[PDB]
């Protein structure tokens, strides 16, 4: 299917006690493969997936240099931004940067992106894709003019459409044992009557990768149901993910309702109903 | 492979 690799960066100011805290992490699809944390003793970009430990020290020395560089630009920004927003020295503020590149089944480039946010809000984002920038406000407009003048988009394009994709392919190839794996979900169903008269069916979906999944409900006279409760997909911890959908129905009939699951791991859509 | 270019201050 489609794949991607993303890099997330977060810096948080701590006026009065140390330099901003910086945490960088890298992903391929739904799997984290690297991290960096200013508060760790290491001061290096560390591996977080088996298939990445194979890269030689030239790679580590390299990613370590780069990430420090991101970190340093963020420390400066924090400063600049207090200024654009006329904020006091006392407050703590957050800068965030996210970029990466998507590929299709053909392992060819689909799209690139590079977004930036301040105090939890969109600051500036590279269009989808272009040389173009979307600027949230008077402050972001300044940055826009600066970055247009310096051709930051052109540099980012070279990366996103070039390097980013090639290293995505390299990792998918190396970590084929993991990243191409497709784990079909294990599905059980639990029953709970709400003090009689009515009843709920909980359609469980466990041990699957990747996270993208769809489980839905439907009935006899017509399909679809918007009177259903479904929790956001959650990580089990072992590398797989979990999710379930619950629907409220009358104690009578019961078996009348059915639950269909969809996932690339499943060749043909699963559908399980209630049984005594 | 992280971005080696196109990373400037705001």
């Amino acid at each position, epitope marked *: 299917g489609s794949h991607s690799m993303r890099y997330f960066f977060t810096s948080v100011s701590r006026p009065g006690r140390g330099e901003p805290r910086f945490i960088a992490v890298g992903y391929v699809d739904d799997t984290q493969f690297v991290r960096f944390d200013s508060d760790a003793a290491s001061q290096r970009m560390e591996p977080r997936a088996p298939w990445i430990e194979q890269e030689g020290p030239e790679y580590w*020395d390299g990613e370590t240099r*780069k990430v420090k560089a991101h970190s*340093q*630009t963020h*420390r400066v920004d924090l400063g600049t931004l207090r200024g654009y927003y006329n904020q006091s020295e006392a407050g703590s503020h957050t800068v965030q940067r996210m970029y990466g590149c998507d590929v299709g089944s053909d392992w060819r480039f689909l799209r690139g992106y590079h977004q930036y946010a301040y105090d939890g809000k969109d600051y500036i984002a590279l269009k989808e894709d272009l040389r173009s920038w979307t600027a949230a406000d008077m402050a972001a407009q300044t940055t826009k003019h600066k970055w247009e003048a*310096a051709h930051v988009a052109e*540099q980012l*394009r070279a990366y996103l459409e*070039g390097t980013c994709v090639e290293w995505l392919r390299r990792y998918l190839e190396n970590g084929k044992e993991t990243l191409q794996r497709t784990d079909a979900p294990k599905t059980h169903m639990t029953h709970h009557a709400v003090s009689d008269h009515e009843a709920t069916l909980r359609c469980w979906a466990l041990s699957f990768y990747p996270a993208e999944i769809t489980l839905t409900w439907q009935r006899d006279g017509e399909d679809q149901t918007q009177d259903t409760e479904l929790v956001e997909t959650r990580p089990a911890g072992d590398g797989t993910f979990q999710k379930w959908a619950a629907v409220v129905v009358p104690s009578g009939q019961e078996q009348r309702y059915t639950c269909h699951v969809q996932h690339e791991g499943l060749p043909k859509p699963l559908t399980l109903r209630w049984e005594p | 492979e992280a971005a080696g*270019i196109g990373i400037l201050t705001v």
Partner: T-cell receptor
Amino acid sequence: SQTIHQWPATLVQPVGSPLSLECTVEGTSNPNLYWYRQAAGRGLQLLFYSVGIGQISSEVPQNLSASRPQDRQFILSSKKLLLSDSGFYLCAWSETGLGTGELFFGEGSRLTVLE
Amino acid sequence: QEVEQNSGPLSVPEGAIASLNCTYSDRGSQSFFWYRQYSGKSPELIMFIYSNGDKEDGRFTAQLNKASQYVSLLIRDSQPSDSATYLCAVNVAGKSTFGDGTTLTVKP
């Protein structure tokens, strides 16, 4: 240079001398600063890099030290030199971050260590 | 070995076109450069380039071919003052790695 200045320009010293090279930059801020070295035959070897003030990285086992006591002041020094230390030492800076990556060099400091 | 560039000295007659090549091994590299260094002086950037294709500025033309890991500099209408050593550089791993440089001499 307008943007970056380095000194002394030429140094002839005996083995065992202490070394001190200074580099001052101007026209930018929070710059990436570099100590490169051009030894036997052209080719710049990176010796130290620094993303910011008080932050120094040594790229190789070495008889030298660098320091950045200030934003735009950069120093390379040795308690005592070895013949191996002769070379053309170059200070350089690059825009804060990871931009195009271009470097701006200083005039350069030529060091000859005589026996 | 990491950035590889033919040592000089290459002769070209005044007015002719000089061509210099450089190859890099690390596909991590994301931007590429040409510095010029005269005897005694520090290097001075002639050009940089970060996308497949050719880039022209005056008599100088850079060529990058990320597929073959090949960077080139061409000097149109070479002059004696173009005699210098040309350093090819590759921005990789957060630093600039340099070839040992190629020496050019434009015979008048």
